[PDB]
Design a protein around this ligand. Structure first.
Ligand code: 0MK
Ligand code: 0MK
Ligand code: NA
Ligand code: NA
Ligand code: NA
Lengths: 420, 210
């Protein structure tokens, strides 16, 4: 049940605890940062505040001010007038409290506190330059193929999914791109404190009994159209168990002359089915790259009800760091609030949560110990418009708060896939 | 500048599909060089006679949260009745809708306006899946009000008795509407969870004749 592993390596939870237990509290009003000390006895005599303003991860201005805060007291820090950004996007302010001197318990440069705010946002009104090429639609009995130079998109007309993509002669997918509504159950989803006691009220059991894990996609609609400068694939699926429709996924795929595939997804969830763990898509990519680069919340694993410690920025990590080695394996490694994701030749853009690793959700839920996991061929990607909270108030009853359950009944997200 | 923002056209295209015409639009709303809102739409009109309106809206994060995100128009038709499947029968707003019941409601047009002595936005109904007015029917998941008074007249007239029925019927169909508040009436009182602060908003409507 630890915040650290047996060898004292931190779980992702540790950083959330560090942030919430900060001794400095912050407020922003216009350009003034208000710093409040929660120390009862000590003055901030080993603290300086770093601030940094960035536009979608690109640093535009930074500075330092020493902290001089009496215990329980306040300090106002007026920022300088900030250079206005040329391009579109969201400005973000980050502040960090840094201890410049070593202590008995910490090293020089130890960060003890941080906080983020959105500043000015400039929405993009510029139309991207009209692309030269136009994609071509090939209608066969088995497939809707789409060509644009070296690139190819294949939509299986029987499954209604994107079965394969090509760049030149290289295949891109090992498994088609499919809706996923389930996650490899967390310890909190399982909800037992004793081995023999089954709880039909636990999230995993409510999901299992409803058929979430073995619901199969049924094709309701797969159609193609030629637009002035694009090909439009429209699909509609229904996930059913014992004659009951659990979810309905309505999609449009739009591939334009620039080689961008825009995916618009609209999901219906039956109100009387237990709320789903996630509303997203997954696929196995053929590629295995060393790095994962994203614009979003990080750098560590973060979930909708455990994301306050994460900061929105540009993060670049070795792929393995995008897997959390919980001894009992489950869904892990998620990052939220993500606008851009880069892996090998692939970039996905939108507003989503993702995890990426060599382990499928199927393997994670079937393997009892982390040492028994085997890296699969390629990379499994799960991209969610929505993901349910993880809970934890206790681990033996449903503990995911109502605002973090996927109960809206109708859900909409949009992804753009391309090569960069 | 929410009240004086002007729609600047970014895109307007037509397309012919196997069974439908598809209109695509984009607008930016701007005040003094600042973009407040962007609206991207598709109107899909097919062989059945139905128009599917898909709306996605971006709202600048640094602009005050807007009071609503929807569409409006003035219909030429004046009908006696309003029939809907949604919350009712009385006026209800997102933070004042617990008393309303989901059902099939049918009221005279006048009952769809609330005669507050000092006039304001009024008569909204939430959780509406279907609205029928004369020959028109709207379907989706939205909030609406319908009356002989424009939002403009309402905000310009200080007393209810000075209002005059405009020609035809003003319809306001909202994907999203801000709470009304009321914990007190002299400081901001709409709770965070009822403020339109999600930045990106999506709703869809189907318009047809019956
Ligand atoms: O009360 C909890 C639970 O009921 C028990 O089985 O495990 C320990 C915990 O305290
Ligand atoms: O994965 C879950 C767990 O590992 C098992 O023991 O109980 C039900 C479910 O299958
Ligand atoms: Na100091
Ligand atoms: Na497992
Ligand atoms: Na008024």
């Amino acid at each position: 049940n630890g915040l650290v592993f047996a060898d004292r390596t931190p779980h992702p939870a540790l950083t959330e605890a560090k942030h919430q237990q900060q001794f400095f509290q912050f407020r922003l009003s216009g350009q003034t940062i208000e710093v409040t000390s929660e120390y009862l006895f000590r003055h901030s005599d080993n603290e300086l505040l770093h601030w940094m303003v960035a536009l979608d991860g690109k640093p535009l201005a930074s500075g330092e001010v020493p902290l001089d805060v009496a215990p329980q007291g306040k300090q106002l820090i007026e920022l300088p007038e900030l250079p206005q950004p040329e391009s579109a996007g969201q400005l973000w302010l980050t502040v960090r409290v840094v201890q410049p001197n070593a202590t008995a318990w910490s090293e020089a440069g130890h960060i003890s506190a941080w906080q983020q705010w959105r500043l000015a946002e400039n929405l993009s009104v510029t139309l991207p330059a009209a692309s030269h090429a136009i994609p071509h639609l090939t209608t066969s009995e088995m497939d809707f193929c789409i060509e644009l130079g070296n690139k190819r998109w294949q939509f299986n007309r029987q499954s209604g999914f994107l079965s394969q993509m090509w760049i030149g002669d290289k295949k891109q997918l090992l498994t088609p791109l499919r809706d996923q509504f389930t996650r490899a159950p967390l310890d909190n989803d399982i909800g037992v404190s004793e081995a023999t006691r089954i709880d039909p009220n636990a999230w995993v059991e409510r999901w299992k009994a409803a058929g979430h894990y073995q619901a199969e996609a049924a094709l309701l609609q797969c159609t193609a159209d030629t637009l002035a400068d694009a090909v439009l694939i429209t699909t509609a699926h229904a996930w059913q168990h014992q004659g009951k429709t659990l979810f309905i996924s309505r999609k449009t795929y739009r591939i334009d002359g620039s080689g961008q595939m825009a995916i618009t997804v609209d999901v219906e969830v039956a109100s009387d089915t237990p709320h789903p763990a996630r509303i997203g898509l997954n696929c196995q990519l053929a590629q295995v790259a060393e790095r994962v680069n994203w614009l979003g919340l990080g750098p560590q694993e973060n979930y909708p009800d455990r994301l306050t410690a994460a900061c929105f920025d540009r993060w670049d990590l070795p792929l393995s760091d995008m897997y959390t080695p919980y001894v009992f394996p489950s869904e892990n490694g998620l990052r939220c609030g993500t606008r851009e994701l880069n892996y090998g030749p692939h970039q996905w853009r939108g507003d989503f949560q993702f995890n990426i690793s060599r382990y499928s959700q199927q393997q994670l839920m079937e393997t009892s110990h982390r040492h028994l996991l085997h890296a699969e061929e390629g990379t499994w990607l799960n991209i969610d418009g929505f993901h349910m909270g993880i809970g934890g108030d206790d681990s033996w009853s449903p503990s995911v708060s109502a605002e973090f359950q996927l109960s809206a009944g109708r859900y909409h997200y949009q992804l753009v896939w391309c090569q960069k």
